[PDB]
Amino acid sequence: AWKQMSWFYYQYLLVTALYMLEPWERTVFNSMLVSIVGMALYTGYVFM
Amino acid sequence: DLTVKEKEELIEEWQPEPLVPPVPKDHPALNYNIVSGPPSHKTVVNGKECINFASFNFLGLLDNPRVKAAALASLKKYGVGTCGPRGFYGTFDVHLDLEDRLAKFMKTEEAIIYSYGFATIASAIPAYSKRGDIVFVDRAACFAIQKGLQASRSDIKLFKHNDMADLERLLKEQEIEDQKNPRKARVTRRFIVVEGLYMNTGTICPLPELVKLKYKYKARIFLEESLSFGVLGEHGRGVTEHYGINIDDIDLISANMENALASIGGFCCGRSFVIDHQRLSGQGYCFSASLPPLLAAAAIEALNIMEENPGIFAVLKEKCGQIHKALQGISGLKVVGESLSPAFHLQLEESTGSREQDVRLLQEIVDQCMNRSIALTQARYLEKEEKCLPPPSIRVVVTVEQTEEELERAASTIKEVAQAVLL
Amino acid sequence: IHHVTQNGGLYKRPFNEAFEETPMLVAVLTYVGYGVLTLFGYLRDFLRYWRIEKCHHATEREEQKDFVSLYQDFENFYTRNLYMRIRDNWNRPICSVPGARVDIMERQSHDYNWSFKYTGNIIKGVINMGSYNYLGFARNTGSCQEAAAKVLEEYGAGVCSTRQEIGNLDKHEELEELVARFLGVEAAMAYGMGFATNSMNIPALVGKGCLILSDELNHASLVLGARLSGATIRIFKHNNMQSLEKLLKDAIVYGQPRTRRPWKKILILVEGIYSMEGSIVRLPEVIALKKKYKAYLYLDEAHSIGALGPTGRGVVEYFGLDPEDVDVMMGTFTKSFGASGGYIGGKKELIDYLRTHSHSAVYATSLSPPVVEQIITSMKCIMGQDGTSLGKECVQQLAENTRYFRRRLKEMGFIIYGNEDSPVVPLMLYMPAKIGAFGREMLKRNIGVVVVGFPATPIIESRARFCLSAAHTKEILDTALKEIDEVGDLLQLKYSRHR
Amino acid sequence: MNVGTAHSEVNPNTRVMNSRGIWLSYVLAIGLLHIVLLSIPFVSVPVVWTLTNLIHNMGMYIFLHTVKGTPFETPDQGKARLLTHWEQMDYGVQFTASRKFLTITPIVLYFLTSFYTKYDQIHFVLNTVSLMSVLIPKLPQLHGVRIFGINKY
Amino acid sequence: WVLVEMVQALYEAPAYHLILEGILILWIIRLLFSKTYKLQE
């Protein structure tokens, strides 16, 4: 369960090349991906 | 156009030239000398016991017991070969120790070592000079400098040997070019390539007059000193110590570890800002196997010996001021080179007509001298592949292992046989 | 015997390679990583202007601020934005004799690889699969070492002159006579560096009015020699005979570019084994094609000599061909013999011309005596002039190890390049972050490897390289295979479709 | 790492646009930009389609027709140091497959943007001016020219 | 359901907005038939 979660996140870090980015650099990417997903989930509900 | 029948005939008609041209056995070379044993103070060349004035180990150190003992102990620990190109498991703890030691000897920030003495300067020049740059080079530069300047496809301006009135003329001609296209002048880099103790002439460069030109016309200096390192100065650092010039004014110094260190390889020293760029852009450093560790352990011990007592540079200096003074007065031969140089020349006065006649005359004196226990050589060049081809000459090389008696004995013998071949 | 082509090439045993194509999804997913890295590199370069100081990089002197800047800034964008992030994979120092097991010096970094420092600890026995040590001659015991020390005691470490003045000793004459009998040629010459053997000898054979035809994957020294010769250079596709024949045919019927005159001569440059790619040259076809169009062949066997052949005599013996059909043969002594240097072999009139006209023989220092003796002693073991049978065992063990390792990797699902007999084994890594993760993960398990990225190769063709040696036992290879299998599940490197 | 290690190409920047999977990756990036713009709540469809076109053309112009040189050190001694990426493609050979793909893509995107705008008069000016700025530099006659000596050194 | 309005705007689209589109189509076809040819020397 928890160990399986750590492996999927590890794969996510390897595919996007965030594995070799610094801790503050990863936060920028994560922020502007979560906000874009959240702002799409809203429009795909208020316009459908 | 051009049908299938024609082509077959075109291909059958063609005949190439041979891979290597014919008619050898007219060259002066192709008759290598054979040396039996090590080329030490007393050697055997062509089966004759003689004193050698032709090897380049000015300080001894080729057959020093301490150097040999230090090389054996590193042979018993690592083996012979570094099986890799310095970037894939080719770096030993001895390499890092030798570079760190060279930097402290020369009092610079960093050093980098190459595994071959000829490649160190042939790789360094094209790492900084590119197609749109201007390089000012002394006309008497050595072959490795010429190959490095050919690999970097930049613009090469030659100036006369050792006069700054001609270099300043070229530099001021560059100002006029600069003034009529200022935007292109801000992206072109300028280099001056000189040498301390030129190999081909035996003279020394005027450095104080050149550092002042550097700051006036904004050009960087590349100093190639493989004949003055371990020779000139009170502590053997080279030509900067001879003139008392701050080493921060130079931007690059290159030497080889094969003349006074009696080893293999070369090195460059300087500031980290310039040195760190060669580790990712020097061809011979990136794509070649690193230096075998027993050769680096032999250079570290040589550095130890050089540091422990610097009175050896005083015996070498006054040893070579005697044979330079003894060879003055030979009829037909003129001496070329400074008094402070351990590797001056000996050139033919009033030439004949051709170069082949002169080489035949000089080889007669060399072969005649080898018969009386004095081993010498004449300088060797690739005649067709030289920017400027020096005159034929004989090399006289001084080392600290030569006694005063045999130093004067050599000078008398050369006079005797040069006045009976040139008469 | 076995099968022949239409050119004239004659094969005596099957010749089969494999270069599987990268899957489309994986190919798409690597451009994402390279794009993200480019975008963050631009942001960091922007922040370096009036923000976080990064007072760790070197800067110009104060007195030279009004000069033109020394470096073009956009060059080494990759150096400071991709390479610096994973550079703890490359210049690892060692403190032991390199073979089958090696000692690594531990180093750690606290500013993301902008500087290193040593912890004082040493990783004892790491499985070495990153050094060129075929035949296992790199060691510090045996007869080779004994002979080298004996020579070192009497001669010294250095020579202080050139072959043409006083630097030609009797050891050089003894070595050059032995290399010629080893290769089966008329005469040979030795140099002192392998990079120099090409870059200082090729310009002595061709010049203006000559054509060089170079393979697509030649080493940097061959390219530098071709650039310094002054000839014209045209590149053909790797091991493509249909491409080389077309190029060679178009060269003769149209002549030189502008004047349209006939060429003075044509020279083909190839290699016996391409190390990064793992492939072997199609020598029978190249020889059959060189004969018909009257060209000259230059063969570079840095990785083939000793490693290939039923007795160790290189790629020419591997195909069963005659060494007298190759105009110039060269190689190095660094990969299979435990020493340093290079050689050239051929006809006696080629060697006489090289002995008077090559840049090395005139201006460079000659080989060290202790290094020469180790070559002599190791070559006499392979030939069999030692009274022992240690030369046949290493040659057989290398082939056995290559077959076993290569075959076991291919059936776990990895993508492997090359020919089935090649002792260099490339394992395909595609995504840029897996280049840096694979090297760290493998060292965490006591295995040392080499990894190469985008600028060195093509964009979607990163990889790791394994070098097999005759000194690797069966249990060492079992351990390495066992750990590779684990890491390939951890990082998902089993890309093969046609398994 | 170092150019020349595994391949002998002297300028690896000249072959990137011919690699496997890059024509599909270039179209999926336009798709992703469009989907991200479509998610803004305070915007209409025509404005989304005009923004897609202008941003794509702007980024394309910067990456293909403004930045000159290579991002790494090559062994040709800075031969391509004054050329843009478009000029170094295939060593200057004209009308290859990639130069055709990159020339046709903006026109196809412009055709869709015109249809999803209802051929408006205001939008037409912006889209046409944006499209011309990325088609003029692709003419073979403009290889190496710099207007008023702009972006020359 | 908004699709037919755009098709209705197509018919009422001004002539100068379709002459340009036709000219661009006639350039795509010419482009797809051009040969290779290295620049010059």
Ligand SMILES: CCCCCCCCCCCCC/C=C/[C@@H](O)[C@H](CO)NC(=O)CCCCCCCCCCCCCCCCCCCCCCC
């Ligand atoms: C955030 C998503 C990241 C992907 C989009 C980021 C776009 C950034 C494009 C990078 C511009 C580089 C193009 C031209 C560069 C030249 O100028 C320079 C100087 O000459 N030379 C170079 O060699 C540049 C560096 C190396 C050249 C190629 C590396 C970059 C090529 C990337 C290919 C396309 C990147 C976008 C791929 C995104 C696809 C997303 C689709 C959906 C993914 C999930 C599908 C399941």
